[PDB]
Ligand binder design. Structure first.
Ligand SMILES: [Cl-]
Ligand SMILES: [Cl-]
Ligand SMILES: [Cl-]
Ligand SMILES: [Cl-]
Length: 124
């Protein structure tokens, strides 16, 4: 079974590029990160910062999660991220995604030792 730390890294990390280069970024990344295997994952967000910078968020501004938990952390500075969401024509096994790139603060839930991000809550 995939660990909660590695699951976040597979779903929400993309340090290779600075930003989403094209509209086909999500269609390629959702397939490459195995998020369209048996079901097209409706909403997923990739971060375009180094692994150390996203892991550093857990020791930053402590905020409440959307569900009610107190282990979420908002980043101090705005980070380059891309939100991938299914379009109207998206239907398995032909998953289609909308690519939207913007610079925002990231909010991530952190747990364990070392204290690393496991869930991507939202972006502000
Ligand atoms: Cl791990
Ligand atoms: Cl997400
Ligand atoms: Cl680590
Ligand atoms: Cl998540």
């Amino acid at each position: 079974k995939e660990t909660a730390a590695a699951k976040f890294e597979r779903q929400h990390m993309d340090s290779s590029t600075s930003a989403a280069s094209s509209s086909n970024y999500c269609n390629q990344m959702m397939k490459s990160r195995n998020l369209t295997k048996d079901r097209c994952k409706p909403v997923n967000t990739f971060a375009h910062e180094s692994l150390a910078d996203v892991q550093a968020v857990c020791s930053q501004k402590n905020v409440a999660c959307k569900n009610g938990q107190t282990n979420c952390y908002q980043s101090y500075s705005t980070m380059s991220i891309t939100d991938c969401r299914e379009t109207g024509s998206s239907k398995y096994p032909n998953c289609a995604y909308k690519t939207t790139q913007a610079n925002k603060h990231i909010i991530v839930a952190c747990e364990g030792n070392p204290y690393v991000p496991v869930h991507f809550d939202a972006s502000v």
